[PDB]
Each structure stands twice: as C-alpha cells, then as structure tokens.
Design a binder for this molecule. Structure first.
Ligand SMILES: Cn1ncc(NC(=O)c2nc(-c3c(F)cccc3F)sc2N)c1N1CC[C@@H](N)[C@H](F)CC1
Length: 273
C-alpha cells in the first residue's frame, strides 16, 4: 500500500469535507474515486467491530456497501497519520445529477419519475441498513449514463438511523426541513422525505423551490415550470410543514405519479444514449 495500488487522477470535487480524486485500481484497472478526509476536520467519529476509531462515514459506508448498486460502494480504506483515505466505486461514463440538470434544464416527467424512483429505492436501502444519509440532493446523486442507474454518494453528513429526535444537522440548509430551521429538531425519515420533495421539485423545475429560511418555514410551493397536477401534488405532500403530514416511502411509491416507472436500461436508451 497504498500509492502503489492506485494511480491517482484529477480532482472531482473538494471542500472543507475533504477532496475526491479520480483514480484507477492498478490491477483491474478498476475506475475508482479516492476520497481524503483530514482527521482534524472529522466531526463525527465511529467505532468498528474490532474497536477501531474511524470516521462515522466509514461505518455508514460499510453498512450500505452490501451490493445493491443504488449506493456507491466503499471498496477499501486506509488510515494515515493525519487523514483517512476511502476508495470508492466510480462508474464510467458518469455525471452527477446537479451537472445533468444544469446542462439539460428541467427534466421531462418520465425521466424525473425514473430518477426519483431509483433515489427512493436507494434511500430505502440505506434505511434498511440502519443508515440515514442526511444530505440527499442532486450533487450527491451519480448517473451511470450507460446503464441509466443512479447511485448515492457522500455519506459524510450521515448518521446511524434512529427513531428518536436528531438535534444536530450538517447537510445542505436549503434541503433541510422547517422543523430543523425552527426548532433544531427533526426525525430522520420525515426529514428525508422533505429533502426528497426538494429534490423532486428541482428535477422537474430545474431549480430548488426555497432559498431563504422564511420560505422554508412558510412552505408555499410556487411552480416556475409546467408540471403535471399529479407531480405537483406529490411534491406538495412531501413538503408538508408538519412532519407527520408527509408521506411514508410506501405512500410515495404508491402515489399515482410514480406508477409505470421505466426500467433503468429503458431510461438510458430513451433519455441518455
Ligand atoms: C463529498 N463527497 N464524498 C464523496 C463524493 N463523491 C464520490 O464518492 C464520487 N464521486 C464521483 C463523481 C462525481 F461526483 C462527479 C463526476 C464524476 C465522478 F466520478 S465517483 C464517486 N465515488 C463527494 N462528492 C460530493 C459532490 C460531488 N458532486 C462532487 F463532484 C465530488 C464530491
């Protein structure tokens, strides 16, 4: 290890969280992503079975990396004196959903339906594995352009899923729910559904619905693009002010707008190729 197992390429994205590089596993050569996180910057720490002190992100990734391709999987990890290094899957070709919507503008509803459905299945997988992502948004969704499959990235803001209130939050504020803005309290699943409503609005309108705290708290949704009544209803349901008025995942996937979703490969052939 470890600079000998992977050839490192260009930066994909960086920030106070850390830095993510394109890479190749020397022996495959598998496309990977190499994420560096400074220990001094790690806010949330976790423990491994063998009792190793490790960024909670590593704990969460291990818990979701079973095989379901809706989450970018953690292939390996290393500890350095001042940092941790994560080796993650990298689909090629790929584009994140933020860039995709930027290039294409608002998405046709048939395409938004397929993307949104796949995000729901991925988020359901995380919760089934005991993991709350806490930063669901277009930037953190990768599109495998050949297969039409979407994949969740960046669990650096995530937490173990629990049924009691969260009093901390470090995801994206314009995706955070009104109960966080107002009371610095939220429950995991209803906060996730709120962020999913923001995500869906962004897909079909090409921009997010709320920019300021007061707009989040008012909860009035104005549509700047033509959107079907069924889609508008689903979005407004996900963005209910009262958390307990929001739909469950089952209720979202049973919604009239969500019926007859395209398969991922269909999605790619029609909309991506
Ligand atoms: C903060 N954080 N932590 C892990 C990750 N990204 C990955 O893990 C990841 N990204 C991949 C990628 C991509 F995202 C875009 C184009 C091509 C790619 F191959 S492939 C892979 N495994 C991130 N990014 C979050 C925001 C993201 N939009 C930034 F572009 C990169 C930072």
């Amino acid at each position: 290890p470890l600079e000998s197992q992977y050839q490192v390429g260009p930066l994909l994205g960086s920030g106070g969280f850390g830095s993510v590089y394109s890479g190749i596993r020397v022996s495959d050569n598998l496309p990977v992503a190499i994420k560096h996180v400074e220990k001094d910057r790690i806010s949330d720490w976790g423990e491994l079975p063998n009792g190793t002190r490790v960024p909670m992100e590593v704990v969460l990734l291990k818990k979701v990396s079973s095989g379901f391709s809706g989450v970018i999987r953690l292939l390996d990890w290393f500890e350095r004196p001042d940092s941790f290094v994560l080796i993650l899957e990298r689909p090629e070709p790929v584009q994140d959903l933020f860039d995709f919507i930027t290039e294409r503008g608002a998405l046709q509803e048939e395409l938004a339906r397929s993307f949104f459905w796949q995000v729901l299945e991925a988020v359901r997988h995380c919760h089934n594995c005991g993991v709350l992502h806490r930063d669901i948004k277009d930037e953190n969704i990768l599109i495998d352009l050949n297969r039409g499959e979407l994949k969740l990235i960046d669990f650096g803001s995530g937490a173990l899923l629990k049924d009691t209130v969260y009093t901390d939050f470090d995801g994206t504020r314009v995706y955070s729910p009104p109960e966080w803005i107002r009371y610095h309290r939220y429950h995991g699943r209803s906060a996730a559904v709120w962020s999913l409503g923001i995500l869906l609005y962004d897909m079909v309108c090409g921009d997010i619905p709320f920019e300021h705290d007061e707009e989040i708290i008012r909860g009035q949704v104005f549509f700047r693009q033509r959107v079907s009544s069924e889609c508008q209803h689903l979005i407004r349901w996900c963005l209910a002010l009262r958390p307990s008025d929001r739909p469950t995942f089952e209720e979202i996937q049973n919604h009239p707008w969500m019926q007859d979703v395209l398969l991922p490969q269909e999605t790619a052939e029609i909309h991506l190729h």
